[PDB]
A paper describes a structure:
Na+,K+-ATPase is the active ion transport system that maintains the electrochemical gradients for Na+ and K+ across the plasma membrane of most animal cells. Na+,K+-ATPase is constituted by the association of two major subunits, a catalytic α and a glycosylated β subunit, both of which exist as different isoforms (in mammals known as α1, α2, α3, α4, β1, β2 and β3). Na+,K+-ATPase α4β1 is only found in male germ cells of the testis and is mainly expressed in the sperm flagellum, where it plays a critical role in sperm motility and male fertility.
In this work, we used cryoelectron microscopy (cryo-EM) to decipher the structure of human Na+,K+-ATPase α4 in combination with the β subunit in its ouabain-binding conformation and in the presence of beryllium fluoride, which corresponds to the E2 phosphate conformation of the protein. Following cryo-EM analysis, we obtained a structure at 2.37 Å resolution. This region forms a compact headpiece, which is characteristic of the E2P state of Na+,K+-ATPase α1. The five-membered lactone ring of ouabain rests facing the Na+,K+-ATPase cation binding site but does not reach to that site, it only forms van der Waals contacts with hydrophobic residues (Val337, Ala338, Gly324, Ile813), as shown in Figure 2a,b. In particular, the side chain from Phe796 in TM6 smoothly fits the bowing structure of the steroid core. Consequently, Na+,K+-ATPase α4 has a proper binding site for GDN at this position as Tyr139 provides a tight fit to GDN, while phosphatidylcholine (PC) is bound in the corresponding position of Na+,K+-ATPase α1 (Tyr124).
Residue numbers in the entry:
A (entry chain A): 47 to 1029
B (entry chain B): 13 to 303
């Protein structure tokens, strides 16, 4: 409720809330308002119970396909039970197996996401927050939830602001609004109307901000959900979740598979009716054919591949809260990033120095992994001693594991920055201050604009040295001599304008400049001279100037390289911040969002001296958009802005406007990633296709809204995420191709049983042993394939056109490789039946006699007479050999699925998981064939040596065919072979 | 997404006529090559298959034991008073026994007389075409006695004394070995002929053993079983018109209106049995003569 309370007079404020601004609310009025208007708490986002999350895992695209398959199998089994005589339990087995696969995969995914949620909950901590309210005429330490509208609240330094406040009294109050507004530097607070916008006026304090220094008193104008943070929370809660890009790809794949399965089933249903089977048998055939196309083992494969990528990312302190988020960065075309706390450290840091007529550039990185400056002159030693001794700041308790930049201190941001800079450049400041004990303090204040101090000199002079720091134009009037190379010269005409040429230069960058001086007091004061601040017992003139130090909020060390890599990957990087346009533009230039040499229209106009309309729209590749302009921008104008400029900076933007920008980018067909840390990024983080929040600097609401957390606030993890997402997309393509290839040798035996009336070449048990057995580890091992080229040199995939599964993959798996695999199994089937006495021509149309349980003298090609059990054992041996042949030809399929463009001799065989998978599937096939008792448990029988060798020529054929195909693809880019087969 | 049947671009289902022609031509050539490769591999394999002897016989040996009539569920249920209750049985028997008539075994270049008493197996050469087709021992219908069908054309079904014809499944080169020194089982069996593979039909349960009446065996010689001069069998290529020896079993004193479970078993050193295959070396038959 900050609509008008800032522009209200001190009398109307008292009348509006029926309170007097010296005594506060009556001790009963507060209780009445508490019980009539509710507590001072923002309502948390709704909490979903565990079983609902588990059931959400149990359903979904692939899971629903497997559920449909299980239901169809159960219906088929019911029909067989009701109408047929002695039906087998194949369909019951299939129903149970499909249900169990769905349930186990759901359990696995739920467990992974619950682990991530537990880590997030452990990170979130609660400490009882209490406020200070002037109730009953005295100070009370009430709980934060009991603060009511109109309450009189006093805030001191280091105190969180309890609610939205309209300040009436203040004494040097400064608050940190970086999380709410995006302003890094603390903002001064005064009890007067300054700006029309409530977020800019200096007489309003907002809930969820920290008071940094001073003290103030104010009236509560908004409570709970009516606060600025609460409205942002409601806006975030009112947003839909949205579908991840990988989920859409899985949905498209399910559509394709359903179409293929239904077409095959209906065509063979019609064929069965034409061949004279019967409606019931035709329905059974239709259900079986439709179910046989369902790849029940591919669901677990996809889940495991996503989990492996998630664990790989977690190894690098990158937490994903769901498995589908592990791919989104690979598909990202646009990154919308906040500046303060996200691209920037959100910490005042020394940036430049000016001494010895020279400008030195400090190392602003957190780990000090940059360029040093010249530290040989003793003027640098004097400057370091001054800046470290006249500081009044100190590290806090324990931060010795942490780097100096990341440590916590006790004092002003400027004092902390000076302390850290001196600590990481000159020497330890604690030892310096021990060697130079203080005598007189003379604290800093605004009116004086300087901080004097007196210390015992380290050089063993037994005397004292006065050290002064403050505003450059303030301390210059006191110093009549400067220091050039440790030589105490005097004031020249040159050394009174180079001071104004460097101050105007370091102050022109938006940085906060400071001056330093010393005097080296005469020996008449000895050691224990009474130094009285209230009088002039010590000289305060003709100081010796040393140098200037400037400070600014710097970018994070990894940010510029990450931005450069993302732009090399074809990703558009947009800066969206709530800070001032000058700071935003400076940071955008510093991190590469605005490239070197690119100009804005307002700069081309000032260079060519032409009106902004006369500016050509070909040299203004960069634009800076103020948030005030966005209030009068329509969808069409926003689309024009987003399309016509490669480099865009949005400054002074509200959370609602960040959401609008993200929605506009998504409306143009882009997959959008948002990186932010403050509460002003939460709606954009939730609306984004992938939301990434900083683990350390981020707020709880933004970390709840985000899909991914950078636990160490490392921006280099985004490039790794893009690379991993692209690689996971490619490897999913390979794994899906490998899994879909084996479908053809699994359904063609049943098709030929129906059409030709031959004994069934492959059984349900062997088919299950392929899908959930020998094919699982090889399919998983394709997730460990390395990139065949530089994936970061590709453009982002077009989601409309570039699909995970398309018609090329179907044609390769079903039409070409699956057919060769199917012919390999039929060859072994025929060789076994011919070696046992049934020539291939004699097996055509034998189904009715072969399946007759009471025909026990069936005649073979030689005139031998067979019992039903004997020929069934022969058929089961043929099915076992068909299964083994499928295993053998899947060796070649796995070898050729390693690459989509490269030859095997180019990529090599460095995937150890693939080799292990080959060995494991071979050993599993051998185990099921030769283990005693496997003829009773399963219908699997031992094989002859030569029956293993029947699939070698077909495997070699598969390998040679794929090698030639990929050679042609490589030789003829964009040619017919590539357009038809390169999936 | 759902409107691709026709388009301004002359695109049928997404592709033009030229694209459709190219993709269909590619698949036609690819499947023709696959079919050629498959046919070639099949022919190369068949080159290694002998035309006179199967490569393996461990799945067909030991042979099974079957019976005529070919019944539906090992059940024989008929009423002697109703001639239509056993017409199917009698028709099945006469259809099976047509090739055993004397008039069908007249060619002296195909058939021969191999004695009226059981004899040792006859070695007719090696499994090849060295001497063309092998000769076939004759089997007379008169050996089947009252189940021969030469006097009673109903095989005892009209009288209520049904006949079953027992046969041993043909296996190439298989020579049955009768049990050694009468050391298999005990019954009023003339199991002293070393040239007969003994066969016996008994009641399945102890209840059945008391309700089966007299069992009559009709065959070559006085020993119930298969004479050994009809073995080995050389296959349908070398020995077409081959006749396997037959044993006729007639149940003359069956209890009426009750279902009788009967087990017929063959005995030999190379004759085996199984709990999974109920027809290997033996079979079960259920017979109910209704009053
Ligand atoms: C960590 C990972 C996770 C994943 C995973 O790995 C580990 O998890 C693993 C967990 C696994 C499952 C675990 C548990 C089972 C249940 C099991 O249950 C079968 C039990 C068998 C029953 O046992 C007896 O059955 C008879 C009992 O009388 C015995 O009969 C003889 O002896 C009798 C006297 O004793 C005489 O009276 C008889 O006359 C004479 O015959 C017989 O010898 C003996 O075997 C099933 O047998 C039948 O097998 C076929 C079933 O359809 C039938 O064929 C039919 O369909 C064919 C086409 O399919 C057509 O070609 C055929 O024409 C048409 O008939 C076949 O007929 C029939 O026998 C079937 C397999 C399954 C689902 C597993 C699959 C694989 C996994 C998913 C693994 C998976 C890889
Ligand atoms: C079981 C046994 C095993 C063996 C066997 O069966 C028996 O296995 C069987 C399996 C069979 C193959 C299966 C598949 C095909 C279809 C066709 O090949 C696809 C032709 C079409 C595929 O359709 C696309 O076109 C769609 C648009 O129409 C697109 O989708 C959009 O649709 C919306 C608009 O509508 C958009 O707004 C949405 O953004 C978006 O959704 C998407 O690209 C895709 O759907 C067309 O392709 C075009 O792709 C590009 C299109 O611009 C061009 O470049 C170029 O013009 C052309 O290539 C040619 C026949 C063949 C190879 C079969 C041969 C025979 C088999 C091997 C059988 C064999 C006998
Ligand atoms: C058994 C021995 C080991 C296995 C060896 C297999 C070798 C081949 C295997 C894979 C390679 C891919 C399939 C073969 C492609 C050969 C044709 C070819 O390379 O295309 C080059 C030409 C022209 O060049 P372009 O299209 O780049 O440029 C022109 C652009 N314009 C046409 C698109 C608009 O394109 C055209 O004529 C396209 C029109 C012709 C389409 C039908 C071609 C049928 C030929 C072969 C099919 C498979 C036979 C072998 C089957 C083995 C059984 C396993
Ligand atoms: C004409 C018909 O043929 C036989 O029956 C057929 C239908 C049905 O009975 C079954 C047993 O359920 C079917 C079933 O339908 C579909 C399958 C489970 C299917 C799938 C595999 C997979 O992975 O997903 C789906 C492929 C075939 C299948 O494996 C079995 C194979 C054995 C068979 O027996 C075959 C009998 O002889 C019957 O008596 C006669 O009427
Ligand atoms: C071309 C090559 C690589 C195919 C694989 C060859 C080997 C590994 C395969 C082919 C034949 C198989 C053997 C067949 C016979 C037997 C005897 C049996 O009592 C134990 C398993 C054992 C010893 C198998 C071991 C594994 C073996 C599976
Ligand atoms: C040996 C045998 O069982 N059969 C004979 C046969 O001579 C006669 O025909 C039959 C009655 O038909 O009774 C007795
Ligand atoms: C074979 C013969 O003629 N004798 C049977 C005799 O064994 C049987 O106990 C009796 C009662 O059924 O009928 C008569
Ligand atoms: Mg921020
Ligand atoms: Na999101």
């Amino acid at each position: 409720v900050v609509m008008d309370d800032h522009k209200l007079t001190l009398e109307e404020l008292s009348t509006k809330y029926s309170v007097d601004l010296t005594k506060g609310h009556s001790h009963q009025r507060a209780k009445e308002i508490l019980t009539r208007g509710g507590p001072n708490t923002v309502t948390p986002p709704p909490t979903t119970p565990e079983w609902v999350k588990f059931c959400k895992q149990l359903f979904g695209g692939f899971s629903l396909l497997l559920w449909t398959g299980a239901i169809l199998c159960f219906v088929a089994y019911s029909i067989q039970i009701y109408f047929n005589e002695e039906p087998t339990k194949d369909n019951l087995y299939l129903s149970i197996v499909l249900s169990v696969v769905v349930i186990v995969t759901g359990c696995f995914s739920y467990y992974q996401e619950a682990k991530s949620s537990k880590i997030m909950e452990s990170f979130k901590n609660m400490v009882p927050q209490q406020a200070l309210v002037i109730r009953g005429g005295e100070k009370m330490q009430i709980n934060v939830q009991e603060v009511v509208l109109g309450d009189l609240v006093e805030i001191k330094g280091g105190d969180r602001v309890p609610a939205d406040l309209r300040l009436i009294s203040a004494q040097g109050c400064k608050v940190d609004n970086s999380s709410l507004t995006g302003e890094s530097e603390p903002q001064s607070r005064s009890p007067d109307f300054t700006h029309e916008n409530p977020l800019e006026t200096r007489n309003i304090c907002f809930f969820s901000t920290n008071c940094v220094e001073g003290t103030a008193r104010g009236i509560v104008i908004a409570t709970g959900d009516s606060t600025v943070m609460g409205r942002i929370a409601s806006l975030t809660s009112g947003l839909a979740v949205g579908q991840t890009p990988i989920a859409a790809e899985i949905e498209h794949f399910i559509h394709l598979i359903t179409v293929v399965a239904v077409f095959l089933g209906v065509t063979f249903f019609a064929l069965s009716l034409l061949l004279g089977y019967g409606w019931l048998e035709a329905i059974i055939f239709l259900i079986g054919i439709i179910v046989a196309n369902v790849p029940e083992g591919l669901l677990a494969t996809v889940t495991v591949c996503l989990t492996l990528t998630a664990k790989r990312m977690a190894r690098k302190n990158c937490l994903v809260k769901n498995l589908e988020a592990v791919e989104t960065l690979g598909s990202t075309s646009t990154i919308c990033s906040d500046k303060t706390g996200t691209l920037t450290q959100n910490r005042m840091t020394v940036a430049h120095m000016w001494f010895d007529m020279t400008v030195y550039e400090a190392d602003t990185t957190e780990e000090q992994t940059g360029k040093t400056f010249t530290k040989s002159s003793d003027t640098w030693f004097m400057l370091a001693r001054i800046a470290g001794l006249c500081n009044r700041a100190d590290f806090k308790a324990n931060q010795e594991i942490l780097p100096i930049a990341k440590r916590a201190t006790t004092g002003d941001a400027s004092e902390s920055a000076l302390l850290k800079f001196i600590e990481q450049s000159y020497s330890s400041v604690a030892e310096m201050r021990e060697k130079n004990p203080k005598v007189a303090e003379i604290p800093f204040n605004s009116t004086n604009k300087y901080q004097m101090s007196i210390h015992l000199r380290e050089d063993s002079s037994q005397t004292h040295v006065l050290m002064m720091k403050g505003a450059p134009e303030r301390i210059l009037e006191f110093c009549s001599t400067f220091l050039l190379n440790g030589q105490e010269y005097s004031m020249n005409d040159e050394m009174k304008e180079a001071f104004q040429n460097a101050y105007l230069e370091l102050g022109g960058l938006g940085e906060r400049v400071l001056g330093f001086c010393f005097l080296n007091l005469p020996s008449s004061f000895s050691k224990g001279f009474p130094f009285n601040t209230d009088e002039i017992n010590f000289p305060m003139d003709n100081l010796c100037f040393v140098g200037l130090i400037s400070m600014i909020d710097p970018p994070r060390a990894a940010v510029p390289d990450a931005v450069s890599k993302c732009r090399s990957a074809g990703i558009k990087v947009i800066m969206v911040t709530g800070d001032h346009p000058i700071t935003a533009k400076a940071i955008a230039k510093g991190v590469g969002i605005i490239s070197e040499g690119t100009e804005t229209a307002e700069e081309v106009a000032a260079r060519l001296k032409i009106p902004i309309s006369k500016v050509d729209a070909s040299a203004a590749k960069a634009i800076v958009v103020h948030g005030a302009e966005l209030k009068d921008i329509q969808s069409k104008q926003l689309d024009q802005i987003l399309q016509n400029h490669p480099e865009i900076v949005f400054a002074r933007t509200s959370p609602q406007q960040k959401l609008i920008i993200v929605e506009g980018c998504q409306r143009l067909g882009a997959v959008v990633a948002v990186t932010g840390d403050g509460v002003n990024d939460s709606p954009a983080l939730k609306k984004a296709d992938i939301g990434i929040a900083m683990g350390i600097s981020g707020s709880d609401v933004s970390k709840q809204a985000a899909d991914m957390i950078l636990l160490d606030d490392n921006f280099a993890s985004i490039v790794t995420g893009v690379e991993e997402g692209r690689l996971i997309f490619d490897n999913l393509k390979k794994s899906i191709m490998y899994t879909l290839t084996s479908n053809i040798p699994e359904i063609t035996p049943f098709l030929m049983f129906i059409i030709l009336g031959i004994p069934l070449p492959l059984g349900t048990i062997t088919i299950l042993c392929i899908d959930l057995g020998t094919d699982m580890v090889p399919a998983i091992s394709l997730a460990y394939e390395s990139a065949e080229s530089d994936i970061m040199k590709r453009l982002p995939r077009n989601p409309k056109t570039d699909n995970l599964v398309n018609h090329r993959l179907i044609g390769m798996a079903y039409g070409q490789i699956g057919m060769i695999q199917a012919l390999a199994g039929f060859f072994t089937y025929f060789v076994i039946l011919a070696e046992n006495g049934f020539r291939p021509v004699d097996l055509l149309g034998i189904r009715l006699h072969w399946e007759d349980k009471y025909l026990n003298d069936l005649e073979d090609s030689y005139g031998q007479q067979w019992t039903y059990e004997q020929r069934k054992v022969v058929e089961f041996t043929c099915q076992t050999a068909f299964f083994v042949t499928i295993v053998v030809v899947q060796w070649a399929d796995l070898i050729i699925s390693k690459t989509r463009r490269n030859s095997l001799f180019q990529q090599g065989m460095r995937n150890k998981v693939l080799i292990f998978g080959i060995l494991e599937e071979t050993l599993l096939a051998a185990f099921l064939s030769y283990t005693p008792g496997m003829d009773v448990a399963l219908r699997m029988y031992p094989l002859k040596i030569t029956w293993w060798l029947c699939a070698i020529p077909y495997s070699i054929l598969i390998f040679v065919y794929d090698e030639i195909r990929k050679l042609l693809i490589r030789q003829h880019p964009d040619g017919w072979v590539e357009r038809e087969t390169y999936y | 997404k759902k409107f691709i049947w026709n388009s301004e671009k002359k695109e049928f289902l997404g592709r033009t006529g030229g694209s459709w022609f190219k993709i269909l031509l590619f698949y036609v050539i690819f499947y023709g090559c696959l079919a050629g490769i498959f046919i070639g591999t099949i022919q190369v394999m068949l080159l290694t298959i002998s035309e006179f002897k199967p490569t393996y016989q461990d799945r067909v040996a030991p042979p099974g034991l079957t019976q005529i009539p070919q019944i539906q569920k090992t059940e024989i249920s008929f009423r002697p008073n109703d001639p239509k209750s056993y017409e199917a049985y009698v028709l099945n028997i006469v259809r099976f026994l047509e090739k055993y008539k004397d008039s069908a075994q007249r060619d002296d270049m195909i058939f021969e007389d191999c004695g009226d008493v059981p004899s040792e197996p006859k070695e007719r050469g090696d499994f090849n075409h060295e001497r063309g087709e092998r000769k076939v021992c004759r089997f007379k219908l008169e050996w089947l006695g009252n189940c021969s069908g030469l006097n009673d054309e109903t095989y005892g079904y009209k009288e209520g004394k049904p006949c079953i014809i027992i046969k041993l499944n043909r296996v190439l080169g298989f020579k049955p070995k009768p049990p050694k020194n009468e050391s298999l089982e005990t019954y009023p069996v003339m199991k002293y002929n070393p040239n007969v593979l003994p066969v016996q039909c008994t009641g399945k349960r102890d209840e059945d053993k008391d309700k089966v009446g007299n069992v009559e065996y009709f065959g070559l010689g006085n020993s119930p079983g298969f004479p050994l001069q009809y073995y080995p069998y050389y296959g349908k290529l070398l020995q077409p018109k081959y006749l396997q020896p037959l044993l006729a079993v007639q149940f003359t004193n069956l209890t009426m209106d009750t279902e009788i479970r009967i087990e017929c078993k063959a005995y030999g050193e190379n004759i085996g049995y199984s709990e999974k295959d109920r027809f290997q070396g033996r079979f079960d038959v259920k017979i109910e003569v209704k009053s």
